[PDB]
Structure 1
Amino acid sequence: VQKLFVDKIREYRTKRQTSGGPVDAGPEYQQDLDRELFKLKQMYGKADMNTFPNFTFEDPKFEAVEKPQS
């Protein structure tokens, strides 16, 4: 069964030799995972690839009142 085994190892290395990527997928796997990630990134969040976030916040204005005693 080792002679059957190396026959499998041959066909993995011809699958390693790629130049156009998915040969058997075609437009079916290309339209799927592009629409699948964009449906998941819409649930994930709108964040850029290199834009680091920076912002500031405003604290509450500590006001005062009057009370006449003594």
Structure 2
Amino acid sequence: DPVQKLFVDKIREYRTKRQTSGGPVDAGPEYQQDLDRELFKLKQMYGKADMNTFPNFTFEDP
């Protein structure tokens, strides 16, 4: 199973990725701008509510 060089190569490279992931590695500002735009469209589709605010409607009657 280890004889195939490519499998072990990918394995070790991903291992290195995991250790370097102590923090996420190689974001790059492009990453941040993409996050910005996609989160913006997501929230705009959803709304302007808080991250985790449990709201209420304050009902009424006819």
Q: Which bin holds the TM-score, normalised by the shorter protein? A: 0.5 to 0.7
Q: Relative to 1, partners in 2 of residues 1:50 and 1:22: Cα closer, same or farther, differing over 3 Å?
A: closer
Find the aligned partners of 1:50 and 1:22 in 2 and give their Cα distance: 24
Find the aligned partners of 1:50 and 1:23 in 2 and give their Cα distance: 28
Q: Which runs of 5+ in 1 are unaligned?
A: 60-70
Task: Point out which structure has higher relative CO (alpha carbons under 8 A, 6+ apart).
Answer: 2
Residue matched to 1:36: 38
TM-score for both structures, normalised by structure 1:
0.60
Rg (Cα) greater in structure: 1
Aligned length: 59
Percent identity, aligned pairs only, is 100
More helix by share: 2
**Deviation string, structure 1 residues 12-62 (Cα, Å, up to 9, x no partner):** 111112257454441011111122111221121122233212233332xxx
TM-score for both structures, normalised by structure 2:
0.66
Residue matched to 2:24: 22
